[PDB]
Design an enzyme around this catalytic site. Structure first.
Site, PDB file in Angstrom:
ATOM      1  N   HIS A  90      24.661  66.528  32.395  1.00 17.48           N
ATOM      2  CA  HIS A  90      24.127  64.982  32.060  1.00 17.48           C
ATOM      3  C   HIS A  90      24.043  64.705  30.532  1.00 17.48           C
ATOM      4  O   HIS A  90      24.289  63.755  29.965  1.00 17.48           O
ATOM      5  CB  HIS A  90      22.801  64.534  32.519  1.00 17.48           C
ATOM      6  CG  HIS A  90      22.416  63.176  32.278  1.00 17.48           C
ATOM      7  ND1 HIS A  90      23.283  62.336  32.784  1.00 17.48           N
ATOM      8  CD2 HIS A  90      21.604  62.616  31.683  1.00 17.48           C
ATOM      9  CE1 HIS A  90      22.799  60.895  32.763  1.00 17.48           C
ATOM     10  NE2 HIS A  90      21.629  61.227  31.760  1.00 17.48           N
TER      11      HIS A  90
ATOM     12  N   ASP B 172      26.564  67.015  36.774  1.00 18.73           N
ATOM     13  CA  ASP B 172      25.435  66.202  36.265  1.00 18.73           C
ATOM     14  C   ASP B 172      24.452  65.923  37.240  1.00 18.73           C
ATOM     15  O   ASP B 172      25.353  65.158  38.295  1.00 18.73           O
ATOM     16  CB  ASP B 172      26.075  65.004  35.645  1.00 18.73           C
ATOM     17  CG  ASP B 172      25.174  63.810  34.923  1.00 18.73           C
ATOM     18  OD1 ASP B 172      23.981  64.061  35.366  1.00 18.73           O
ATOM     19  OD2 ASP B 172      25.399  62.783  34.481  1.00 18.73           O
TER      20      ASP B 172
ATOM     21  N   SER C 132      23.917  57.551  29.611  1.00 16.45           N
ATOM     22  CA  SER C 132      22.813  57.573  30.575  1.00 16.45           C
ATOM     23  C   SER C 132      22.259  56.208  31.108  1.00 16.45           C
ATOM     24  O   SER C 132      23.028  55.264  31.496  1.00 16.45           O
ATOM     25  CB  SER C 132      21.833  58.308  30.114  1.00 16.45           C
ATOM     26  OG  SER C 132      20.759  58.636  31.090  1.00 16.45           O
TER      27      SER C 132
END
Length: 257
Positions: free
Chosen positions: A204, A173, A127
């Site tokens: 995600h 995602d 991320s």
């Protein structure tokens, strides 16, 4: 002949194993400056030195959400520096600065500095931590590799990167969609070997649970570039097969490197 090669000749089973051939030790990060702490993982075999990889969190999260990576990778013959950021809302570029500060702590101050080869370092993240890898690689082009897991960054221009780059994307995602994050990053890198692997049906949070497909290629990328270990080229090139019913939905790379 390659003095950096570690462990027996690999196989698909050896790179998919939850635990590699190296017994692993661990301890918290205590006393460090320039980042939030975290946990180090390392081979207990001190007959030799190993490369090190720093791993940075990113979805308003802490190291616990990536911790399975510590033993998974250290047991393949690496020192893993799993960090907390200064704050859980830090932006991507500060996370890259913190990745470099954690590498410098590990090689100059940590209890395990003597079993790190400070010339053979890598950075990774999930991320916004993955988004920090542009800053880390472009501020420190001596890094041997970067590995982004669902990387997130509003900055789509990663053309500064000259460090071998592996990105994992998740087909499901919605936060760091391949179309808006990983693929633009990948397409912008023109000056480094690169690899993009997209996991079918993965959201995600895919890096936050043991994932053999992600682990096998993360290990292979570290081996190839941190250790110059061309025994692992066989897994990267051609790399995975793709399909809607497979673990991997998309695959792009610059094989044969």
């Amino acid at each position: 002949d390659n003095p950096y090669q570690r462990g027996p000749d690999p196989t698909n089973a050896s790179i998919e194993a939850a635990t590699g051939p190296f017994a692993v030790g661990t301890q918290p990060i205590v006393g460090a400056s320039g980042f939030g702490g975290g946990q180090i993982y390392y081979p207990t075999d001190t007959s030799q030195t190993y490369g090190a990889v720093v791993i940075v969190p990113g979805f308003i999260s802490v190291w616990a959400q990536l911790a399975w990576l510590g033993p998974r990778l250290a047991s393949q013959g690496f020192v893993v520096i799993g960090i907390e950021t200064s704050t859980i809302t830090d932006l991507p570029d500060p996370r890259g600065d913190q990745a470099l500060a954690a590498l410098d702590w590990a090689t100059t101050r940590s209890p395990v500095r003597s079993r790190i080869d400070r010339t053979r370092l890598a950075a990774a993240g999930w991320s916004m931590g993955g988004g920090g890898l542009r800053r880390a690689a472009c501020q420190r082009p001596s890094l041997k590799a970067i590995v982004g897991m669902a990387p997130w960054n509003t900055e789509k221009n990663w053309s500064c990167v000259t460090v071998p780059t592996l990105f994992f994307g998740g087909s499901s995602d919605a936060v760091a969609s391949p179309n808006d994050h990983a693929k633009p990053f990948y397409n912008s890198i023109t000056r480094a070997e690169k690899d993009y692997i997209e996991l079918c049906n993965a959201d995600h949070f895919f890096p936050t649970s043991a994932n053999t497909t992600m682990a096998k290629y993360f290990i292979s990328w570290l081996k190839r570039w941190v250790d110059n270990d061309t025994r692992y080229t066989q897994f990267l090139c051609p790399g995975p097969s793709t399909g809607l019913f497979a673990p991997v939905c998309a695959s792009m790379n610059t094989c044969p490197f």
